[PDB]
Amino acid sequence: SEQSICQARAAVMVYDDANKKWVPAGGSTGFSRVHIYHHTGNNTFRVVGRKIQDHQVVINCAIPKGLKYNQATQTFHQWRDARQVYGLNFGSKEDANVFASAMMHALEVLNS
């Protein structure tokens, strides 16, 4: 379904460039439920990630229309914003593919 396409479980990651290491976003190992939400009132999209166990929000960001979203592997996607690199480590290839499709749709909307 469309709404099911708009979320997926993944570990949210950030890249420590100085030490060349991927680390958990928010410092919290584990998967989050990662959603793309269409905030229609101001015509924005947000990516919101909340940890599956403790339910802490680890990412909550507006998607910029010029985002370069890279599908680096079958289960790991990444993007930059502000020289800060974020990643999503999906639990499965199928969920990675559906979330990518959701992101690409959001970017199409934001650029029309």
UniProtKB/Swiss-Prot annotation:
Domain WH1: 1-110
Tissue specificity note: Expressed in myoepithelia of parotid, breast, bronchial glands and sweat glands. Expressed in colon-rectum muscolaris mucosae epithelium, pancreas acinar ductal epithelium, endometrium epithelium, prostate fibromuscolar stroma and placenta vascular media. Overexpressed in a majority of breast cancer cell lines and primary breast tumor lesions.
Transmembrane region(s): none
Subcellular location: Cytoplasm; Cytoplasm, Cytoskeleton; Cell projection, Lamellipodium; Cell projection, Filopodium
Top-level taxon in the UniProt lineage: Eukaryota
Domain notes: The EVH2 domain is comprised of 3 regions. Block A is a thymosin-like domain required for G-actin binding. The KLKR motif within this block is essential for the G-actin binding and for actin polymerization. Block B is required for F-actin binding and subcellular location, and Block C for tetramerization.
Quaternary structure and interacting proteins, as annotated: Homotetramer. Interacts with APBB1IP, APBB1, PFN1 and ROBO4. Isoforms, containing the polyproline-rich regions with PPLP motifs, bind the WW domain of APBB1IP. Isoforms, containing the PPSY motif, bind, in vitro, to the WW2 and WW3 domains of NEDD4 and to the WW1 domain of YAP1. Binds the SH3 domain of BAIAP2-alpha but only after the autoinhibitory region of BAIAP2-alpha has been blocked by interaction with CDC42. Interacts, via the EVH1/WH1 domain, with the Pro-rich domains from VCL, ZYX and Listeria monocytogenes actA and with TES (via LIM domains).
Family membership noted in the UniProt record: Belongs to the Ena/VASP family.
Miscellaneous remark of the record: Required to transform actin polymerization into active movement for the propulsive force of Listeria monocytogenes.
Role description: Ena/VASP proteins are actin-associated proteins involved in a range of processes dependent on cytoskeleton remodeling and cell polarity such as axon guidance and lamellipodial and filopodial dynamics in migrating cells. ENAH induces the formation of F-actin rich outgrowths in fibroblasts. Acts synergistically with BAIAP2-alpha and downstream of NTN1 to promote filipodia formation.
The protein, known as: Protein enabled homolog
Gene of this entry: ENAH
Residues of the full protein shown: 2 to 113 of 591
